[PDB]
Design a protein around this ligand. Structure first.
Ligand SMILES: [Mg+2]
Lengths: 121, 114, 98, 55, 104, 67
RNA sequence: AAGGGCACCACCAGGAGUGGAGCCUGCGGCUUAAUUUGACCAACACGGGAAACCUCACCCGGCCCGGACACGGACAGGAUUGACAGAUUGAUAGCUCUUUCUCGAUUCCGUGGGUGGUGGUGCAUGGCCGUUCUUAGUUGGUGGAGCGAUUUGUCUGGUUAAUUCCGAUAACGAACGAGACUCUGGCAUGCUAACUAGUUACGCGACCCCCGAGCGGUCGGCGUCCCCCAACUUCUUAGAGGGACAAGUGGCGUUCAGCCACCCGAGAUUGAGCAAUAACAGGUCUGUGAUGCCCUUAGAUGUCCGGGGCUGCACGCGCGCUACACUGACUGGCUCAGCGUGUGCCUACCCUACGCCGGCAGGCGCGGGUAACCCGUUGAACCCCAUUCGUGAUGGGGAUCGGGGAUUGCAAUUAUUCCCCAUGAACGAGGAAUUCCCAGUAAGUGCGGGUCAUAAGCUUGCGUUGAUUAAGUCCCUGCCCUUUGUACACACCGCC
């Protein structure tokens, strides 16, 4: 439930009437022109999802681009977001719509502070 | 007007043009005893005056080299054709020209003199 | 340079029409400005002139961001027998009104 | 690569859109009065352009 | 045309502008056109301040540069024609001249 | 260094001999066994490709697709 | 060690402060695949260094030669190049493969040889730059002394900011530095000029008084260079000029250099720039088609593209900003600037009036300005006048954090920035220590430019308000000269 509407209505919710439901930044993002990279990724997920086996999750697809906003039509996909080193698979939950792909592939590993060295004498 | 830039940018472009021309003539007329360049500008046409010790050397065969450099500056800054003239002026008292004496010394040292 | 003939001869005849030619150093320039309709990327003309310099027919002066190629006397006959043009047509700097 | 990726990356603005009009460097340029010159090159040529020191 | 023209003179220095503004108007008086008085616009002062070091290491010395641009406006107005009458420019290098008309 | 992948193999051309993909018989009767690219930029001179499911024009890059 | 002089990068007396809290930024360290790298008074809001791409030099993958030229193989019965589709790929990179079309001498391979490099070397270097050192010092010729290293000149004394000058004088004659110089600011009712600045006068007007003034008052309302159809430069502009010289007086002084007080004067010390010899293994090969040498050069340290990173955090440090409140905060009203910018060769990207929409952040049309014509008479802030508050972590404080809305772009997430509504955290004036500074100065206070497609807590300048303290010293840190002592000379961070 993204804005009170259910997921299935979000599947057939076209871009122009969905931009109202999106926040300001996403609405500006859809208002500006989608490029061929986004469309190619969408086609790849559509092909994989349709060729996905029943009751079974699809195969993984990788991508460098992480500025892709999540569409409800991608819920439940296997996408590989690059972290600068590797492509990290991530589930698309039905609550991740207003989120970037890169928000879930962390670019650094967390810091566990060891003993400081010669510095800060 | 809209096509012509303001006074400030005009003076800036003039200075840039002068500096680029001087630097190019330095890098090109190094051995010909280059001393300095003087540009006289009119809206009808501009005049470029080059100060050098060896005027007979900077002028090519029947003025070939001076024609060459005139065509170079013509095609470079995109003047209208025949709106720029290249005059070579033989300097007086070449011992006083710091640039010319510096170039003669550099030529001497590259020659291998003590 | 995989550059074709259609621009090789065009650049060569431009170089022979007048004793010099002016080129700015930008390999990503889509087009060298003069002969604008010939559709010649700047990289092709730069490397053609560089090859000619390597074979010594032209010498090169480098200012801030430009090339000022000066055709040589050894370039005269080479342009002549590459353009199939008799030794009576000269570049502009050679003869004038005589 | 081919024509579709060798120079496809946009540089219609920004620091990578500009270079020193003399030394082709991208640092310390002076875009005031459309100068488009590196700082060090401006020091080199300021006499030639005519910017002199008074104070 | 009956012509009323505007002439502006500008350069970097003051002496050359002064001698041009003097010799032109003297020639006009000798050539009996009444002359609008010489008008000096406020001086343009292009100020550019830059660190002296080309390295950034040191005591932070900033060098400042000035280009004083001076410009003068003198109008030639005569009952007779002007441009066919006065044609000579007498212009040294370094000073810019631009001649406009009243309609311009 | 020590790249994890092996050094990338550049494509090697098939090194074709004489083309000879058009035949005449009975003292000579022309038979274009290749599709002709219809465009002016391709011209009536060149032939098109004879791929198993489409036809490619070398210059016009038109693809005539048949099901 | 003595003698003498001198400096808010020293002090004295003061002021504002930092260090105490939060935040911004750069170092260090930690962590990482990468957190690129230089720099340790004279590094640490520095590299004009406010990184989404680029930048970028770092990490992770994928392209091409943009390897000239020579020779030899290869070849029009084809050197070789591109490309539809399918996989494959992040990629609609014909990058690779299946598949066949197409270019034709441009190109392929090998051997030499290029070339490129933000690759290494600032301890090979040039250039510039900082520092010694903005103190006053420094050198030649000839002559004197000395075997000579050197010395004299270049100094007893006085005086200066000043080896500045007077003087003595084995020195004489010079030279640079300083001074001088240029700009800057201060007075010029003196000159010149002014429709891209105006002033004054007049006439149109509008409104208040009209009891009655009426040559009453305001107008940033309109006209009088619209060409005969007012004058003038006080204001504004910027040129020529002038003006200050210790000039006069009194006093001190060898009565020389000169110093103090006083008159008249705008000013009786306006600030900057430039700036000597010799140097530092101080910095920059990441400015350069500045460069020696060395490294790499096709699986590229070249170069392109995609993504990440340069922000990453147990902590330390520096330059800053916000603040700790009533000398205040909020709400309203009144009211005054100057610097300087504004539409682009590449280069797309200007400053903006007015009108409408929306509450704000913005958007929608009409213009102006390539500029003393337009923004703009730059209606700035602080300040001033009234309101509420009332000594509380309170209406101070706005860090953290949520939701939403706008602009730039191809892309705003690890939030670009702006805006609305929420949160009011430390902080009650800051240890040991320490920065800066003598008049339009510190401080408050805003505003321009630089970086900018988006932009300033930075910086360069600008203006507004505007002080206390002091006219001295070597006590601390040092600087310069003479004498002195040395076992130092890489020079007391010495030597032993
Ligand atoms: Mg409150």
């Amino acid at each position: 439930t993204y804005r009170g509407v259910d997921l299935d209505q979000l599947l057939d919710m076209s871009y122009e009437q969905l931009m109202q439901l999106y926040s300001a930044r996403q609405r500006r993002r859809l208002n500006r022109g989608l490029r061929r990279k986004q469309h190619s990724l969408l086609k790849r997920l559509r092909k994989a999802k349709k060729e996905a086996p029943p009751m079974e999750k699809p195969e993984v697809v990788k991508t460098h681009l992480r500025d892709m906003i999540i569409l409800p039509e991608m819920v439940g996909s296997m996408v590989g977001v690059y972290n600068g080193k590797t492509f990290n698979q991530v589930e698309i939950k039905p609550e991740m719509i207003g989120h970037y792909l890169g928000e879930f592939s962390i670019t650094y590993k967390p810091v566990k502070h060891g003993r400081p060295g010669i510095g800060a004498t | 007007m809209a096509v012509q830039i303001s006074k400030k940018r005009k003076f800036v472009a003039d200075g840039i043009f002068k500096a680029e021309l001087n630097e190019f003539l330095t890098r090109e007329l190094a051995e010909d005893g280059y001393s300095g360049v003087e540009v006289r500008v009119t809206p009808t046409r501009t005049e470029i005056i080059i100060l050098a010790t060896r005027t007979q050397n900077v002028l090519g065969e029947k003025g070939r080299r001076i024609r060459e450099l005139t065509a170079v500056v013509q095609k470079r800054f995109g003047f209208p054709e025949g709106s720029v003239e290249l005059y070579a002026e033989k300097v007086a008292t070449r011992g006083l020209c710091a640039i010319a004496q510096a170039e003669s010394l550099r030529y001497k040292l590259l020659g291998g003199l003590a | 340079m995989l550059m074709p003939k259609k621009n090789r001869i065009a650049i060569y005849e431009l170089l022979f029409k007048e004793g010099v030619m002016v080129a700015k150093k930008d390999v990503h320039m889509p087009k060298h400005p003069e002969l604008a309709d010939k559709n010649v990327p700047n990289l092709h003309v730069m490397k053609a002139m560089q090859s000619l310099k390597s074979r010594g027919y032209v010498k090169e002066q480098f200012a801030w961001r430009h090339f000022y190629w000066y055709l040589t006397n050894e370039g005269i006959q080479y342009l002549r027998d590459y353009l199939h043009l008799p030794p009576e047509i000269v570049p502009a700097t050679l003869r004038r009104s005589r | 690569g081919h024509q579709q990726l060798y120079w496809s990356h946009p540089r219609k603005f920004g620091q990578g859109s500009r270079s020193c009009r003399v030394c082709s460097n991208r640092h310390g340029l002076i875009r005031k009065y459309g100068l488009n010159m590196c700082r060090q090159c401006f020091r080199q040529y300021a006499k030639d352009i005519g910017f002199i020191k008074l104070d | 045309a009956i012509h009323r023209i505007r002439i502006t003179l500008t350069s970097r220095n003051v002496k050359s502008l002064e001698k041009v503004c003097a010799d032109l108007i003297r020639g006009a008086k000798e050539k009996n056109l009444k002359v609008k008085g010489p008008v000096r616009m406020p001086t343009k002062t292009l100020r550019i301040t830059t660190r002296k070091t080309p390295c950034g290491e040191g005591s932070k010395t900033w060098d400042r540069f000035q280009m004083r641009i001076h410009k003068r406006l003198i109008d030639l107005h005569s009952p007779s024609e002007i441009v066919k009458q006065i044609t000579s420019i007498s212009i040294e290098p370094g000073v810019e001249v631009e001649v406009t008309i009243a309609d311009a | 260094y020590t790249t994890p992948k092996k050094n990338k193999h550049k494509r090697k051309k098939v090194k074709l001999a004489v083309l000879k993909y058009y035949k005449v018989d009975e003292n000579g009767k022309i038979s274009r066994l290749r599709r002709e690219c219809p465009s002016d930029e391709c011209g009536a001179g060149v032939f098109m490709a004879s791929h198993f499911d489409r036809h490619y024009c070398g210059k016009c890059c038109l693809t005539y697709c048949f099901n």
